[PDB]
Write a protein that holds these residues in place. Sequence first.
Motif, PDB file in Angstrom:
ATOM      1  N   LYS A 231      -2.514   1.263 -11.674  1.00 50.66           N
ATOM      2  CA  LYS A 231      -2.335   1.914 -10.384  1.00 50.66           C
ATOM      3  C   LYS A 231      -0.886   2.359 -10.246  1.00 50.66           C
ATOM      4  O   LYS A 231       0.033   1.608 -10.591  1.00 50.66           O
ATOM      5  CB  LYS A 231      -2.717   0.981  -9.232  1.00 50.66           C
ATOM      6  CG  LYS A 231      -4.215   0.867  -8.997  1.00 50.66           C
ATOM      7  CD  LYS A 231      -4.577  -0.496  -8.429  1.00 50.66           C
ATOM      8  CE  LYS A 231      -6.083  -0.708  -8.423  1.00 50.66           C
ATOM      9  NZ  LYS A 231      -6.800   0.441  -9.039  1.00 50.66           N
TER      10      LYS A 231
ATOM     11  N   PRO B 205       4.140  -3.022 -10.034  1.00 48.30           N
ATOM     12  CA  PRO B 205       4.446  -2.481  -8.706  1.00 48.30           C
ATOM     13  C   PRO B 205       5.937  -2.538  -8.419  1.00 48.30           C
ATOM     14  O   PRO B 205       6.633  -3.467  -8.834  1.00 48.30           O
ATOM     15  CB  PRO B 205       3.651  -3.391  -7.763  1.00 48.30           C
ATOM     16  CG  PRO B 205       3.471  -4.659  -8.530  1.00 48.30           C
ATOM     17  CD  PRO B 205       3.309  -4.235  -9.959  1.00 48.30           C
TER      18      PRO B 205
ATOM     19  N   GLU C  57       9.068  -3.178  -6.188  1.00 47.18           N
ATOM     20  CA  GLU C  57       9.380  -4.088  -5.099  1.00 47.18           C
ATOM     21  C   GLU C  57      10.450  -3.495  -4.187  1.00 47.18           C
ATOM     22  O   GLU C  57      11.154  -2.548  -4.541  1.00 47.18           O
ATOM     23  CB  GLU C  57       9.841  -5.439  -5.648  1.00 47.18           C
ATOM     24  CG  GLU C  57       8.836  -6.148  -6.551  1.00 47.18           C
ATOM     25  CD  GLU C  57       7.426  -6.164  -5.986  1.00 47.18           C
ATOM     26  OE1 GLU C  57       6.864  -5.077  -5.737  1.00 47.18           O
ATOM     27  OE2 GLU C  57       6.880  -7.270  -5.793  1.00 47.18           O
TER      28      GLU C  57
ATOM     29  N   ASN D   6      11.848   4.361  -3.431  1.00 46.69           N
ATOM     30  CA  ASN D   6      11.153   3.780  -4.580  1.00 46.69           C
ATOM     31  C   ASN D   6      11.034   4.792  -5.718  1.00 46.69           C
ATOM     32  O   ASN D   6       9.949   5.048  -6.244  1.00 46.69           O
ATOM     33  CB  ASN D   6       9.777   3.249  -4.175  1.00 46.69           C
ATOM     34  CG  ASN D   6       9.861   1.994  -3.334  1.00 46.69           C
ATOM     35  OD1 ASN D   6      10.941   1.438  -3.132  1.00 46.69           O
ATOM     36  ND2 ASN D   6       8.718   1.537  -2.837  1.00 46.69           N
TER      37      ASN D   6
ATOM     38  N   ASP E 202       2.380   3.656  -8.029  1.00 41.64           N
ATOM     39  CA  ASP E 202       3.019   3.584  -6.722  1.00 41.64           C
ATOM     40  C   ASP E 202       3.757   4.860  -6.349  1.00 41.64           C
ATOM     41  O   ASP E 202       4.166   5.006  -5.193  1.00 41.64           O
ATOM     42  CB  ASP E 202       3.997   2.405  -6.676  1.00 41.64           C
ATOM     43  CG  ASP E 202       3.310   1.070  -6.852  1.00 41.64           C
ATOM     44  OD1 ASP E 202       2.195   1.042  -7.412  1.00 41.64           O
ATOM     45  OD2 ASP E 202       3.886   0.044  -6.433  1.00 41.64           O
ATOM     46  N   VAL E 203       3.938   5.781  -7.288  1.00 43.37           N
ATOM     47  CA  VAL E 203       4.764   6.962  -7.075  1.00 43.37           C
ATOM     48  C   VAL E 203       3.874   8.189  -6.968  1.00 43.37           C
ATOM     49  O   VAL E 203       2.735   8.206  -7.449  1.00 43.37           O
ATOM     50  CB  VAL E 203       5.799   7.135  -8.205  1.00 43.37           C
ATOM     51  CG1 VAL E 203       6.817   6.005  -8.170  1.00 43.37           C
ATOM     52  CG2 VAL E 203       5.106   7.194  -9.558  1.00 43.37           C
TER      53      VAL E 203
END
Lengths: 533, 533, 533, 187
Positions: free
Chosen positions: A269, A522, A524, A365, A271-272
């Motif tokens: 998965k 992921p 943080e 992020n 995150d970006v």
Amino acid sequence: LGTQPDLGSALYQENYKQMKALVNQLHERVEHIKLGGGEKARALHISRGKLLPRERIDNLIDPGSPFLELSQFAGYQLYDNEEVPGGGIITGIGRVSGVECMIIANDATVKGGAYYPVTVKKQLRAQEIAMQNRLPCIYLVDSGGAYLPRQADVFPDRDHFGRTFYNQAIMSSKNIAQIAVVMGSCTAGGAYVPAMADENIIVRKQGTIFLAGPPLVKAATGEEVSAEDLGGADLHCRKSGVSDHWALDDHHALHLTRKVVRNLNYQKKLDVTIEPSEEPLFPADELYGIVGANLKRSFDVREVIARIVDGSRFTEFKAFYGDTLVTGFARIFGYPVGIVGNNGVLFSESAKKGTHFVQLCCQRNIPLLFLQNITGFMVGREYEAEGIAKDGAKMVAAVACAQVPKITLIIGGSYGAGNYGMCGRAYSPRFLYIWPNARISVMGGEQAANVLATITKDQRAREGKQFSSADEAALKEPIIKKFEEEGNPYYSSARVWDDGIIDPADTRLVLGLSFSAALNAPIEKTDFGIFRM
Amino acid sequence: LGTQPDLGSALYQENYKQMKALVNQLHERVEHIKLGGGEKARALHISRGKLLPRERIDNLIDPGSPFLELSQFAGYQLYDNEEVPGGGIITGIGRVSGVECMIIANDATVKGGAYYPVTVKKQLRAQEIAMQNRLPCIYLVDSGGAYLPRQADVFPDRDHFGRTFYNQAIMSSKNIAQIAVVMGSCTAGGAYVPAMADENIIVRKQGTIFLAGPPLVKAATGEEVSAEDLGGADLHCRKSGVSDHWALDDHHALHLTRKVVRNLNYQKKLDVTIEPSEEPLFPADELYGIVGANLKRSFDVREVIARIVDGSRFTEFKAFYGDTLVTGFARIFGYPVGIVGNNGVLFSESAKKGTHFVQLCCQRNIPLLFLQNITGFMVGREYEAEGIAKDGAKMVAAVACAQVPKITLIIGGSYGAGNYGMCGRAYSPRFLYIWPNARISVMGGEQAANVLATITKDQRAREGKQFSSADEAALKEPIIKKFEEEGNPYYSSARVWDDGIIDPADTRLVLGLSFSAALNAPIEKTDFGIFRM
Amino acid sequence: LGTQPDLGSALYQENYKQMKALVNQLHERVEHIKLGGGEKARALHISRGKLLPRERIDNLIDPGSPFLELSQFAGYQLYDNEEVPGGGIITGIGRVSGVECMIIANDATVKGGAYYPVTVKKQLRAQEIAMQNRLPCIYLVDSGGAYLPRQADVFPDRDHFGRTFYNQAIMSSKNIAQIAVVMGSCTAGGAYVPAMADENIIVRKQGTIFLAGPPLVKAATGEEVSAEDLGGADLHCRKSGVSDHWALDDHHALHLTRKVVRNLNYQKKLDVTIEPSEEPLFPADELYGIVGANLKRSFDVREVIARIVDGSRFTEFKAFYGDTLVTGFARIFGYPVGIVGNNGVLFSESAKKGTHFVQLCCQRNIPLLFLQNITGFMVGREYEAEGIAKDGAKMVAAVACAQVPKITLIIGGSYGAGNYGMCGRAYSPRFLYIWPNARISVMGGEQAANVLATITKDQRAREGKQFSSADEAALKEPIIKKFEEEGNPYYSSARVWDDGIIDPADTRLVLGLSFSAALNAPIEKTDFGIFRM
Amino acid sequence: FSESAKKGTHFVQLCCQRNIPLLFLQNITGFMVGREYEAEGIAKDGAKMVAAVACAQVPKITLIIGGSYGAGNYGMCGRAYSPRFLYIWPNARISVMGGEQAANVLATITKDQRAREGKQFSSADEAALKEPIIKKFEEEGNPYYSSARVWDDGIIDPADTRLVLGLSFSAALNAPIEKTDFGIFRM
């Protein structure tokens, strides 16, 4: 970004010629390392029915998938009279059953697979990479134990052989799968690797596991037993229970390993945000002419950026402030990246500009990429009065606390505190690569020579003695030779200070593979310390 | 627990005499290390109005409070012709304004405070201890920079000098106060320490801070400037702003430091149940006769326990199962502790018993204490068939994942995988101490000799040549000498493999101080990996 | 609160006489149950050197501490011709080493410790209480296995014997210590109890543990082996490893158990405010005259409250609204408690008042005490038109979702949906107690009789047949007898519908002990469903 | 056996770590009986599986395709261990022990007791004792007896096993899978 270089220019012709020679030198040395122990060792290895270590990796990973090998030059001329190609171990990241995994395989053709001090460090580095990115670890175990003549540098300390099992236990507790494939003999600490793994595969006859080898059993109890009887797949598979899967041969074991990974119930998965990939607008091989091999000459880092980012598109941040540092947003293979690269000596404005940029990336992020080509900090009475050290410390604190994935590429010099501010090895970048023309040391070779010349010259005056020009040269020469030898990329890479020496034409591909692997974990939230305003 | 030993017995008389000699040797060597650089260096230091490094610590900590120094023997005979008492740095835990703090002081009398490779390792170990136990860090900075002749082992790598600033940034982000007291010169990287700290104190004239020293300024720009003008308290205090507090002399600086700590707004809270303390029922000095200096002789570890726990009260767990290992519950200075100690060779039952005990302590959040006196694992065909390796790995996995504070004390041999199972250095115990009679290596010196004797004997037969008894002795002798030198406590302590060599009579006090410091951080829940049943 | 009752009044004299007789009946019946199996069984039990089950508890708990036994009347006349005093098991809450623990001891004198269906239910209730209140569980195991003639009601279902081990595993995973003391034989499922415990103690010769007993071993394999050899402390303690501690006799085992509890590293913490305790301003024994044994007569619940709360102080909430229900804030032994008690038929206003009060207690994390003396809901066409059911449901929904500790005490009738609204057994109160005069059933015995009389009378008219007055009595009599037998407190308590029948004079002490135990677990936040307004 | 229990305990941890649903197929005949097995802690091994199965937080479905007796029922996720669903085939049998074992156990006990009293228990006496016991366990172990009371969620045709499991697992996936917390593993 980017401009068309003057191919006819003499500077470009010379720079291309010099860089090309370095790349050719790098290629042929790897070819030799590719052969491992040698023809006699390789012939003996195959005569036992075992696959060669690199053929095992080829069969393990998905068909046609790229393999990112790490620290190919570990142990290169590290030991005086012993040749240890690749450190006796092969580590890298490849795709198994569609999942990115870290593969750690002992090279049994090199010193029978014994663990040299560099071998432990290379494995520990691989485990650190796997944990930080949540990559499953696959151990192709074929080892001969620790190298007794150098035991003090293998066994005792925290970063010594014992740490290998500690890392396995920690990753298992975090649901980072640990898979061990016993394709040969493993003795003493080696037997712990299959025992500490979540799932384990052992070959019918090649694989042997025992805490105490036959030689120790005979000495301790005076009993003669073959390795197969003491260990062996059948004993562990059917009686000891140490084995989870039983394999007929190397090919069967590799097939079983692929099945084990497919049952991990893992799905990647992101995150970006993602955008379609685009090739850079300029050829990568032009980097040879642009950069060259002379660190005294300077080049525009934007030219390097223009040839690695998608579509050569770059949004520069604070372009006219602290111009010796370049920061901006781009995309590599669709991933968003914030790029920080040196374009001259670091100043107070440059450090402030970098500190501001790093906060922006952490807030959103966004992964960070550092391009180190440093020549030092600004030196001057006024700069110190204005707290250049205070400003330089600001960047160091921000870079250390950043929790976004960080990748560092040394395309030039790396000296002094400039290394720390640009995410050196001490600051835990996910990966660190160096170009064949790079130099790294506490300070430049010339500065150390000149500093000693001034110190000795003043000291001679204090004693009243005279230090002549010939005296100056005699002092300088040994220093310059030492820093040139110890700052060489091969010296740095022989020890595990970086993750490999890469051809500049391969920079975009290596970065794409590295960032893709780093995104398995992921991202943080970043917590900063006190910013000393 | 405990029994009265036979003082009249010849064995007790011999054991007491041998251990006493070891303790006397340890004491007198520390006396020499206490003197640092020497009389000439000490006289010069005082002539500049500066306090001696150990006098600074005495004035810093609370009056009469004990000070737990660490790694006193770092650098002992580490470098061929250079004497570096204590590694050139003094580190320890003491109480400042009622708060336990890690104190890191450079020893300017030793090589002018230059950073040798061991000096960096000692400092990093201290920072690691402070981070794990949430101890505020106080840096008494008086340094001369990195040692250029050994730059390759100081600057570049992850655990090299750059990591010092990374640790400061991380600790600051976690609210672990970083306080820097510039009591002298700090140049190049040294200037970063005051800049990286949360609060900073500089002395009026002794303290100097500059990224580039006067020698580099002259070479780079051809300007002559004194260190005070380039740095100095006034420049940083009033114009540069790097200095937060301005001190008149060393005494004033130390007084200000105590005030800074008092304003941290920190109060210690205990997560464990507490009971009133009681002294052990037997004298501590009897440990000399009981243990001795001969590792071939064996003693009951319960005797050691009886002389360090409160009231000599001990609740043993699984006493009659796996009797070669001793586990139970006790209290030291009122704290609850689970003790694991070797009483012979490790067996499958012992490992299973140990793994069960570690889960109990982790469940109840009880600190763990390990007493390593190992001689190896059981060797036998049957034991391997029953998965002794599978059993030994179980203890290793449990020990690694345990999140309770762990302290390890080596009271005897420490060899092979037995070291890992008993929380060796690689498994991150909060502290690791060794008695003067300890020995640590990959395997016992005799085993390595016997193993080589068997291998060469068989190899000679294969070649058809003969290996005589004199041939066997010639082979064995060099190996036994090597393992004796590299297994010696001073060899292990000169390099930072342990936190100190401690007199057995001081064991209870050292443990009490260490556990008290380790309790500053809250105990986290333990997450285990897969137990390979 | 409270008023002085008229001791001279005939009503008070009659009520005191009737209630006193009920208490005397309760006391003497417990005396018989105290003797367990009988003199012959008790003599045989002692002849083997074993302590009597109740003497074990006396020695286990702290000297002089009160013991809160639960379900003393389980199995009272439950089985046609078999007497099973106390269900063959003794359960209660006491203090061991200063920690409140739940004690579960098998009574070997009763049917040799066999598990009757009630025995499993009583144990499961004890485990449920321990889990909800986080009380460590101590099992004094002396059992003869399941009772075969009734296996269908012991083995198969979810709430059957198998659930006992499930509870142990779940409690262990939550750090609720499980301690097993094998003071006798345990066979088949019984052998699992010591195996499932965190720490285990077995007596040297009395304790036997084996999955298959000697009788099954002989039948399956034709081998004759004694129970001690098959099980026994020595085999498990030293060879099997199932035993964690080895005890010489019952006294030694109990002494060891106290040591184990002291090492749990547990300290009780209170989430509620505390105030100094005070005795009620009125004698408790006056409750005999006030309440009596006739449920048709009514009394003021405030009089009951005045004689159990500290200082007879009570802050009534919504005193004049829904007066048939009484709610207010008081304190018992310094604990804050919200009291809800019936004072007549429930109305729409009463339900709304109760629902409002429960939200207040849940918001402030105040324990709730329910005093059930119900006679039904208001019956009328208008009340249904105004949604009395909608109002009654509101209280049920609020009571079910409340997460504060809840204790229910039935001091009178408990019929129909009124039972649900006042935290019946189905709504998981921490404890449920009943006075000797209580009655519980789906409806009052008279209502069932009258309802059938009306139904049959109409049905006879429809058929054209005549139902005479004598016909009415013949129908009513069997119904009234049935509801009297099945609504009796002994019938309700013989099965585990409540945690015990208590003397009204002991109400304050029982509540104080119960609330104190219920406070061992932290109070969670309450999440409510949709309030149907 | 001891090895079987250890193997099961290891597997359950693997499934819990990866959040994989668990399916149990119960066809039991008891635990291994022997003096040596008890000396090696078969009970200690059997308890390990029970503890692991109880704490597992992944969805669990149990299908009894044969016998289900004694502690073997508990180890294989019986009704008492809260499987999401429990199904039984039409040929299944469930009880505290096999009907024959209860008969033989009583035969051995009574025969010894008669000898102690000095009285004689004949072969015909043995049959008279055994017959009522075997009849009782047959009626109360029958699937219809077990399903008439709610001990299982239904009796299913073996040909429908795949469809029933597919529907059941699909429904069980409506709730998020929680992390599993285990107790102490008595090694």
